[PDB]
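Hi Q.,

Before the meeting this afternoon, I wanted you to have the XAT prediction in hand. No need to reply - just skim if you have a minute. The sequence and ligand are here:
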Amino acid sequence: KKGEWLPGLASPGYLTGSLPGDNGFDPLGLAEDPENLKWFVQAELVNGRWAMLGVAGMLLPEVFTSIGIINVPKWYDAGKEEYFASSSTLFVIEFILFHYVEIRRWQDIKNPGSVNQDPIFKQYSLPAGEVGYPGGIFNPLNFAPTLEAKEKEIANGRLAMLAFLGFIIQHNVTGKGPFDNLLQHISDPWHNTIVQTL
Amino acid sequence: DIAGLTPCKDSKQFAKREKQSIKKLESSLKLYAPDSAPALAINATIEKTKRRFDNYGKQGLLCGADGLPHLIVSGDQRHWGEFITPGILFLYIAGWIGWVGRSYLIAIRDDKKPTQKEIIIDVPLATGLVFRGFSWPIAAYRELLNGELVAKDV
Amino acid sequence: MRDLKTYLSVAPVASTLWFAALAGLLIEINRFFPDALTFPFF
Amino acid sequence: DWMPGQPRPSYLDGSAPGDFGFDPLRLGEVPENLERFKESELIHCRWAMLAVPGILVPEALGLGNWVKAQEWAALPGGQATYLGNPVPWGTLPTILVIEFLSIAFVEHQRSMEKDPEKKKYPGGAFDPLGYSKDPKKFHEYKIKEVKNGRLALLAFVGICVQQSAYPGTGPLENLATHLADPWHNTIGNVLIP
Amino acid sequence: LNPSLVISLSTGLSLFLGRFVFFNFQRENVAKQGLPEQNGVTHFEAGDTRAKEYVSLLKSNDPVGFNIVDVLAWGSIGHIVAYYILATSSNGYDPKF
Ligand code: CLA
Ligand code: CLA
Ligand SMILES: CC(/C=C/C=C(C)/C=C/[C@@]12O[C@]1(C)C[C@@H](O)CC2(C)C)=C\C=C\C=C(C)\C=C\C=C(C)\C=C\[C@@]12O[C@]1(C)C[C@@H](O)CC2(C)C
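Predicted structure with the ligand bound:
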């Protein structure tokens, strides 16, 4: 019992439940190759973590501002508000910082354990974990990287990715954020759906 | 503007063309009963013609000295709707088609009588394969990186 | 039935049905979004 | 290593002064091209290490920038200026041909040698202080040289592309306008206008 | 400006360069490039009587082998650039910054 996305359908051979969150869901045969699968598990993890952070920062501030604690703009507007620095300045800053961190992560994906150690201080390396979940300093509270815990992260990350898809499509066709959408729907549900939206 | 062309909405020849077009159809509507089938059909196409000219005006097309909406393909971002986004859509659809065909050819290449499955399509296998075209770009990228898209040995 | 299913998948008939479906689809698409010289949504 | 976690090219062990295994285009695959490449890299590095102080310190003084300082020649009555003095032999043709045959003689004299190590490190009349006495203090001097030289090449290409970004300005002027407001005067506005 | 001053000076400089600077380089290059050949033989060894090198006028009494044809070549270069200098120095042209 490795979980089944479609109860009556068997699971693919390349998927064997070894990876956390494996429910036998690959209809398009995207990972029939082992190296493709190894790359895609990392892709899913990083996309999902970014989506978690993203829709957290997209939605939680919105309800915080709509119950009268802070006053933040809408996510689809917050870029236009001007900050202490130019926007292009922030962009190139982020570009240089992200280029070094992503390159590091890439070098470990291609050859695991080759970039574990600090390049400046030759002590302070990382414990030999496994690609995708880099422990050590990236795990201060030192939680147990248990299999069930890894599955929870994969489960949440997929939900956050779908939530982000929903956020952007909702704002594109509706014209407002997520929380306004939800409260305006649950206000009068039978007359506030997509049908009335479209 | 670009290439000396002018925004059709503000051009005069573009309007003159619209009025002339609309004019001739109106003449065809006349000499028949005011609310007849043919007359109703002529009216329909008149409204359709007015909608097409207004749609052209709204989309911000470029009109020359003849008033015909010219298309810019240099890459100017004010004009990606004319060639480049339709081009990306086409490339997607054509890659879909070609990848599905190639997938099928590879899958049937292993039987003893492979020509039998070419003059007579295995439609169950084909329907199993058609929807991989949806992800064909990622699959083809990873196949090129793998080195299995292009046959070695040749 | 089995043989009728086979014959209905021979190359000429498979391709005529495919192209008739494609023609119907394109015809309806241009019946709903007529006179389209560009992609005006985004 | 130029990129931890990346295998080294076989022909680049790490003994040559300055070898950090950087060769993504595999240009030094054939050894007799690698010899000439080491020579040419050292020549470039030396020229730029000499040039960048010459780009910066006259503009640091009350003279024009490196491109303003070479545009009198674009005008017919061109007359040079050193330290605020009109040099006598200052017109364009005198300058041009004296420079031409000077450099041509010395450059031919240079490539008329077939060591090929003295090709890069000739020494003798070019080593008055005689820092080449200890074969390993010599080696780490070599390392320091090519390191500073790569830095200077980087600095020079940066200078000239900055010039192409803000035409009619000097590198120290760019440093000044950056220090005037660091969070608003950066490369951002030249990448995203 | 004084045309003869410039012509003589420039061709003298070109000849000085050819005899004292680029002589060895040109000599070794002309040696390593060799005589033109057809089917492995030089043009004279294939039956062409007119393609025989003029060994009489080519030998010289110069300490290094400077002879008539190379003074011809170097001096002609000197004259070419001398006339370029003259022509462009009085064409009165001017670009603009
Ligand atoms: C023949 C010469 C030439 C060429 C080659 C180009 C090329 C280009 N011009 Mg230009 N132009 C030219 C002449 C030319 N121009 C002239 C003479 C003028 C003066 C009139 C202009 C004026 C001009 C302007 C004003 C602009 C351009 C722009 C552009 C760029 C638009 C496309 C783009 O942004 O990238 C590509 C766009 C994408 C969305 C990338 C998606 C494509 C995908 C990745 C490929 C799809 C493949 C497949 C589906 C999937 C991959 C499969 C594979 C992995 C196997 C493009 C690179 C625009 C620009 O600056 O670009 C920003 C623009 O603003 N041009
Ligand atoms: C699996 C289908 C398939 C694929 C992937 C390709 C791919 C390719 N073809 Mg090709 N071709 C095909 C079918 C296919 N072809 C057929 C059926 C014919 C007979 C008319 C040709 C005749 C042909 C010629 C004469 C040339 C190519 C060329 C090429 C290459 C350049 C792209 C191009 O110009 O194509 C052009 C496409 C066509 C001329 C017509 C395509 C026919 C349809 C659209 C494809 C058929 C799909 C199939 C029936 C669907 C079955 C799926 C299954 C589920 C039932 C490219 C790699 C060119 C080349 O050599 O590149 C350098 C070239 O000169 N093709
Ligand atoms: C990363 C991501 C979003 C990141 C968002 C961020 C950072 C938002 C940041 C900001 O908000 C803040 C914080 C503050 C705001 O003021 C500003 C912005 C800038 C707005 C979404 C990913 C979103 C990713 C999505 C939606 C992925 C969908 C993938 C799907 C559906 C694939 C399904 C299948 O692949 C399987 C699983 C199996 C295959 O065989 C078949 C198919 C069907 C293909």
